[PDB]
């Protein structure tokens, strides 16, 4: 139709083309105009002219006030970090330096600094720069812990709520408990003055912390506390965060009936207020995919992560930790989905993208590698088995062994010898040594995984079930131990049918191994009845291939707030 451009957008291009001779006067423009000049600078590819003005804290504070065009600001910021300029660290250091000077100043200037710090730290935490958002929030806390007045406790407990989110995401779990204790101390100080702050956000962040350290027993209790603390006046972001963390804590204790309601309500709230193209909606999508992957709904989980990643590649840009987490989550889901098919082409591409981003933006001794690496170390294993060559198989298995050793070392340094993540790494190493034909080492690693996981989780937990399934596969197919394999296969089958019913996908990988076992030892009646059982399992599996997309399965207004919360609370009795 060829509509002529708006005089606003025509003068913006004329202002940008005259940028150098009118750079000082642009800073004296309305915030909506001033952001559009910088967005036009990014659009024209003039990042160095744009990056030299986003480095100043006060100039970046005005473009942070454009809450409407924040999806463009995140993309500009991610372009600047990929450009080479370290604006995230420069802005954090500038805020801390200009913050230490007005510690003794009046209440209005400190209030302005606190507000600027909240908006900047929220931006840097949303963008994924947790090591840089921590310094901003630390300086905000340092302002808050100066005058022991009324509003300062509220602002300090808000600072400590925001410090957990930038420490859980930065894998500083040792400082997370200290931050929660400090926040709880300030809440007690508030309670001594007859005023109770809303503790839903803090308890949700602590639930994230305890789920990250694999403390699911405590994580479930603290998410129960957070959901009890949810009120009607909570912001949408806070209740969404609490709901999705409570879903992640409920699905890991295998309360799938409650986790589905919590995460579907979280996804619905995220899609209503934020939209289908928002970072928080993408976070809810990642947690929904985590739910779907844990409940043997893997085909829908891949599509959910694919929807989650596509939001993060649009809102953010290239080398970002949020895009990296979306990649490493989608790589694992595509791995588990295409495990039987063997088409590890997209899974390897997504796992390689995750490591190619985390290594660039995080130190080599960081915990977030231990996820991405191990995901690749799974796929590289299954490509090694599928490859008919022996040289390529040996090279891939050696690379996967190096990646698994690195991830296990990171998990041991972070959590300890007796964590569930360390047990997962030991189980993966046992599978790899089974693939590497080191059968004694595989047996030792699987026994170590069983011993670590049995005490931490339940005796009949799902993780213990899959790990005894791996050990039974090792004993049956490789070590020819025909009785320990039988008992472990029976344990895995019993737990799978107890938890997921007859539709559990690991049931076929247990039945085929057990049929091979019985063919090796005899008792053809057992073989016949387990062929019948496998046929029935295949029937139920093809019947449950509805695979309706879970994006619209959350529907439009199935229930409301403080109804899913209330149902989850009453169901605890």
């Amino acid at each position: 139709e060829w509509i002529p451009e708006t005089l606003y957008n025509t003068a913006i291009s004329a202002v940008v083309d005259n940028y150098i001779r009118s750079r000082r006067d642009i800073r004296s423009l309305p915030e909506n105009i001033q952001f559009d000049v910088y967005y036009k600078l990014y659009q024209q590819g003039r990042l160095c002219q744009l990056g030299s003005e986003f480095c100043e804290l006060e100039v970046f504070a005005k473009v942070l006030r454009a809450l409407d065009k924040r999806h463009l600001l995140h993309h500009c910021f991610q372009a600047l970090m990929d450009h080479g300029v370290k604006v995230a660290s420069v802005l954090a250091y500038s805020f801390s330096r200009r913050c230490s000077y007005i510690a003794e100043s009046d209440a209005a200037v400190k209030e302005k600094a606190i507000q600027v710090g909240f908006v900047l730290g929220g931006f840097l935490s949303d963008a994924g720069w947790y090591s840089d958002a921590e310094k901003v929030f630390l300086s905000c806390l340092q302002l808050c812990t100066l005058h022991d007045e009324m509003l300062h406790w509220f602002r300090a407990v808000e600072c400590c709520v925001r410090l957990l989110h930038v420490r859980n995401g930065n894998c500083k779990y040792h400082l997370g408990e200290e931050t929660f204790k400090l926040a709880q101390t300030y809440m007690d100080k508030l309670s001594k003055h007859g005023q109770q702050a809303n503790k839903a956000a803090l308890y949700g962040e602590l639930c994230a912390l305890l789920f990250a350290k694999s403390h699911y027993d405590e994580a479930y209790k603290w998410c129960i506390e957070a959901m009890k603390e949810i009120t009607a006046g909570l912001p949408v972001k806070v209740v969404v965060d609490v709901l999705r963390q409570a879903s992640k804590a409920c699905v890991v204790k295998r309360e799938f009936k409650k986790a589905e309601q919590l995460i579907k309500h979280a996804v619905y709230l995220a899609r209503d207020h934020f939209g289908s193209k928002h970072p928080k909606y993408s976070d809810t999508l990642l947690d929904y995919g985590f739910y779907l992957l844990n409940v043997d709904n893997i085909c829908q989980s891949v599509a959910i992560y694919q929807a989650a990643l596509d939001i993060r590649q649009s809102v953010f840009g290239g080398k970002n930790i949020h895009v990296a987490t979306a990649h490493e989550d989608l790589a694992y889901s595509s791995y588990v989905h295409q495990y039987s098919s063997g088409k590890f082409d997209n899974a390897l591409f997504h796992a390689e993208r995750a490591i190619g981003i985390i290594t660039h933006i995080l130190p080599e001794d960081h915990l977030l590698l231990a996820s991405s690496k191990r995901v690749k170390a799974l796929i590289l294993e299954e490509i090694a088995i599928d490859c008919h060559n022996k040289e390529t198989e040996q090279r891939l298995l050696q690379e996967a062994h190096d990646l698994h050793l690195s991830s296990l070392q990171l998990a041991k340094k972070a959590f300890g010898e007796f964590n569930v993540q360390t047990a997962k790494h030991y189980g993966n190493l046992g599978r790899l040594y089974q693939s590497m034909r080191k059968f004694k080492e595989a047996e030792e690693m699987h026994i170590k995984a069983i011993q670590i996981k049995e005490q931490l989780l339940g005796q009949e937990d799902y993780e213990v079930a899959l790990s005894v399934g791996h050990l039974a596969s090792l004993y049956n197919y490789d070590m020819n131990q025909y009785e320990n394999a039988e008992k472990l296969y029976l344990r895995s089958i019993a737990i799978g049918k107890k938890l997921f019913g007859e539709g559990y996908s690991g049931l076929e990988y247990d039945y085929r191994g057990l049929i091979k076992l019985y063919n090796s030892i005899g008792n053809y009646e057992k073989v016949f009845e387990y062929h019948n059982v496998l046929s029935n399992w295949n029937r139920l599996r093809d019947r449950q291939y509805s695979v309706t997309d879970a994006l619209e399965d959350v529907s439009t207004s199935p229930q409301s707030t403080e109804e899913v919360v209330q149902s989850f609370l009453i169901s605890q009795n």
Partner: peptide, 7 residues
């Protein structure tokens, strides 16, 4: 295949 998917 022999064993289940890697956890």
């Amino acid at each position: 295949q022999k064993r289940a998917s890697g956890q």
